[PDB]
RNA sequence: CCGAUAACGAACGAGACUCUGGCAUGCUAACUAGUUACGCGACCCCCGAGCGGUCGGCGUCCCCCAACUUCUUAGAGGGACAAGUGGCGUUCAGCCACCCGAGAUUGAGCAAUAACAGGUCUGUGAUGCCCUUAGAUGUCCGGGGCUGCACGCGCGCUACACUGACUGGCUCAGCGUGUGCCUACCCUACGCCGGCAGGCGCGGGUAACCCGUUGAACCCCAUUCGUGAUGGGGAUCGGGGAUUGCAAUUAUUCCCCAUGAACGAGGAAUUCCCAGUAAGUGCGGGUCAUAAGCUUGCGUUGAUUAAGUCCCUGCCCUUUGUACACACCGCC
């Protein structure tokens, strides 16, 4: 049943929600962007370091398969 | 700071930029339809690898004193699906590790050794590890 | 009713019955109270000295 | 011991049940009350705990 | 790091084992706090040596299972030094305390043995010793995860770092806790 | 006169010869500092000698192992075991003993095998097996 | 980020905008992923793209080169069209070009009574493995 | 085994043994090991650190009339022997725990009496008898078949993917194996050429020297991908090109293109096994002109879990019943 297909590039509405959503998560990777968005996940994987614009996000730490992706930083 | 003391896989990185940003080593044209060894599926992406594989296979040589083409091409293995038959090591290509080898040879990285087989010159003993001086002191990171 | 949860460990290992080899019989301390004796199944490999789980602590487990 | 903490009385014997068990032979050896001996065994008709 | 055995970048001391019966065959710390989860390793030797056997290195190799990845304990010991740095982003605090109170109340307090019972097989009630609670909890929780990252992406660090949340609190919201419920239930049936 | 101390600790067929020498001492791997090699999560794994007993323990050691033989991994039990073999012999044959003893001490209560050899070797396989154990299927109607 | 072509057509064959260019050349009959790059390296459109943008100029130029490929330096790996035999042409067939080819050679073997062709006539293997156990259905 | 003991003391099997596998800064040594580290005497280039002294380091310049066995090798040795202590035990035979430490078990070969129309006459110039015996079932040439295909079962491999797929890179062996062999034939280092198969140059090799620090895969690390029967998978065919072979049609084997399948974890069943074990993973050997999805070894990565029971299957003894002794697959 599991089927999951979703759009390449975000649409602008969705951008914002990805520009204004993603600082509302913590624990984000390729996938926590591409199951509560519906991004490919390669965009994903993309719309990421993308998100590094000024760090929007906070790399704990890039293991070379996986990103491992954190809240803003705030306090 | 020699090879080895600098993290040794953020070398090849720089000395690929090096001989790109030199601007010279002698890029041919079996290149855009290479395969690479009849090992691989594929053809790579990084559209750029004898700069980054030049760059392995010089330092290589500073690793190990003589290496011949035969040496080149084994190094560079993998497994091979013949299919649904088991894996198997299958050699790397000769043409592209020798083609490195010569091309080395034209900047003068390399020499032909006595007793058969490539080593580095002096000159490129140089280029090589100066950078890794710039590797280590690029950062601590 | 009544619906405690007592960890007690039989002082000694007692035998290895079961069908299959499975249930080491225990005499086992109340550890809650150290006068109630009882004697349970047990099926993970137990030893002497080691504290273990009964729901109910009445019906004492006997010839399986 | 149940029992005898929760007595009302003091002490107490508590009683026995006297059955007179009594079986076929059939049911004495299925239900293993006797077993089934050595022909010099077989004699030897003494009770031995 | 002299002064004191840590663990990569871990605390393993201000770490208790929050359930007697357990203690003592949780190893998070004899005096010996690992810092890796790999180790040589001969505690499948003798036979209660195997609890002497560090609750985290027990669980890599638990998690290094599965036809297509057997022996790659260099590869799931990133699995699980990787998993514990998404815990206490969430919960703060040792992610040891969320693994160690995590298999406390992630395996049972008592279980349902087949005994042959004639033909119709009528299960019993039995304790265990911490071992087929412990090890049931460590697959159910290394399975769940397993489970739920086939068909996502999930990271397994990340699925792992779910149950081991999930079960940390009796969050009734993994795969381990939702097992660790049902022999339980399958035991009060039989009695 | 300085220490020259050599010792070896082995996994499977792992001989890892490391060496003491007297010095600053900032310890390597046939020619690499500690902190490459780069199986990479083990590393602490290599480290702990040093992790344990303090940096301090080294600062009159210089210490140069090689390895050749067996494994990737084995290969750093190999190198972790000889650097604290080594290290070991060190603070016996000249230095003292109470330090040498409170190393062996600091090691030992969690080994790792870390004086001790592995005993454990491998199988041999048997015919009518893929393995030691295993069997071949057996058919059966 | 674009995502305007919503797909696109090429070729006469139906093809995927969202998957990536390399991937999106491979679907048309006579390609594959091998030749499928080196058309996009020749052309220099740049690999890292979806089949979904582009321009028309783009695609043709995918489609001059493909169609005729030996003219833009490709060398004769990446012809699965080699020595033909009906002159000796040594091309690249595409499209359903490829299936009249097969069919023209596989009716060519059976109209020369020769083995092969009896072969698929019957629907066989032609490549001599055992057919006891495989090749059932 | 001890002991109860009409038995006492003996013999074969088990055990002891051999090979093997692991502790042996203990010995004898070793340019066909290694070497080791020196001494470092150097070349030596900033290979790298460092202003420079000095140092870290591969390579070499070696050689040697260093020195040595730290690992390598293989000889002699030692040891490990329920040996100590604490339980348990008829307080015997032993069992269990712990100490020192390899804790009494690392793994095979060898394997009795006695069997069995087991298999083998196609391993035997071992062969009883029988056939056949020139038109020869004597030996071959050419071809063909042993490969054929609506179905059935048997051992294998590869998958089903993202703890993974393909894209960079780093980098760790072991047991072997090799020419120049009983009739014509290898192992291969290093040059060019070619994409590659390969090709064409040339070099060492009765080998611990040459292949060959056997420079591997998983593995490990560097980017793609995004859960699409998709980049997994990778069948079936189209077309080329090499190689072996006098000859590959009946795709020989390989490469290069090109097509591009079912399988998204397997219905009824059932084998395998406890420690460096299962699994994966290449690699040798055997098979070989050509050549392996075969086995037999070898490491390498290396788990989970039993450590008990006889619940199923099948084995040992004892007692017993038995109309069975072609032995219950019986007898009736």
Partial sequence: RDKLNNLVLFDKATYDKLCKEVPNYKLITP????????????????????????????????????????????? | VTVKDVNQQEFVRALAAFLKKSGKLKVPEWVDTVKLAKHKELAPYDENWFYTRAASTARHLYLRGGAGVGSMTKIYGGRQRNGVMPSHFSRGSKSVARRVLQALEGLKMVEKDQDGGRKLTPQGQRDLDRIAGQVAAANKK | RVQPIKLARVTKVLGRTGSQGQCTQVRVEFMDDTSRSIIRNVKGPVREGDVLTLLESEREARRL | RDISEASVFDAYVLPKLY??????????????????????????????? | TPDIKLFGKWSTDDVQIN????????????????????????????????????????????????????????????????????????????????????????????????????????????????????????????????????????????????????????????????????????????? | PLQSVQVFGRKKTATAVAHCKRGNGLIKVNGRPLEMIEPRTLQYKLLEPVLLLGKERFAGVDIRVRVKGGGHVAQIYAIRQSISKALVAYYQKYVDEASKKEIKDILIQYDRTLLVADPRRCESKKFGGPGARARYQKSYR | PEK????????????????????????????????????????????????????????????????????????????????????????????????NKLREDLERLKKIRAHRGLRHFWGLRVRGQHTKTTGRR
């Fill in chain 4, 19 to 49: 059955v007179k068990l009594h079986y076929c032979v059939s049911c004495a050896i299925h239900s293993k009350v006797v077993r089934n001996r050595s022909r010099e065994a077989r004699k030897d008709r003494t009770p031995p705990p």
């Fill in chain 5, 19 to 191: 359930d007697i019966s357990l203690q003592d065959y949780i190893a998070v710390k004899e005096k010996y706090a690992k810092y890796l989860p790999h180790s040589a390793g001969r505690y499948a030797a003798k036979r209660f040596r195997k609890a002497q056997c560090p609750i985290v290195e027990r669980l890599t190799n638990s998690m290094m299972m599965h036809g297509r990845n057997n022996g790659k304990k260099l590869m799931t010991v990133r699995i699980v030094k990787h998993a514990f740095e998404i815990i206490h982003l969430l919960t703060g605090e040792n992610p040891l305390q969320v693994l160690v109170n995590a298999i406390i109340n992630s395996g049972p307090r008592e279980d349902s043995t087949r005994i042959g019972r004639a033909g119709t097989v009528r299960r019993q009630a039995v304790d265990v010793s911490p071992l087929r609670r412990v090890n049931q909890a460590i697959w159910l929780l290394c399975t769940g995860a397993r489970e739920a990252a086939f068909r996502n992406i999930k990271t397994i660090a990340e699925c792992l770092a779910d149950e081991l949340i999930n079960a940390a609190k009796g969050s009734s919201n993994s795969y381990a806790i939702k097992k660790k419920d049902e022999l339980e239930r399958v035991a009060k049936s039989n009695r």
């Fill in chain 1, 31 to 75: 996938a926590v962007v591409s199951e509560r968005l519906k991004i490919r996940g390669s965009l994903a994987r993309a719309a990421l370091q993308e998100l590094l614009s000024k760090g929007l996000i906070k790399l704990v730490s890039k293991h070379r398969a996986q990103v491992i992706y954190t809240r803003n930083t705030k306090g």
């Fill in chain 7, 4 to 99: 305007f072509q919503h797909i696109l057509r090429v070729l006469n064959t139906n093809i995927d905008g969202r998957r990536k260019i390399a991937f999106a050349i491979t679907a048309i009959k006579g390609v594959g992923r091998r030749y499928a790059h080196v058309v996009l390296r020749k052309a220099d459109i740049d690999l890292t793209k979806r089949a979904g943008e582009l321009t028309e100029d783009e695609v043709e130029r995918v489609i001059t080169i493909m169609q005729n490929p030996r003219q833009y330096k490709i060398p004769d790996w990446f012809l699965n069209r080699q020595k033909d035999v009906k002159d000796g042409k040594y091309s690249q067939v595409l499209a359903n070009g490829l299936d």
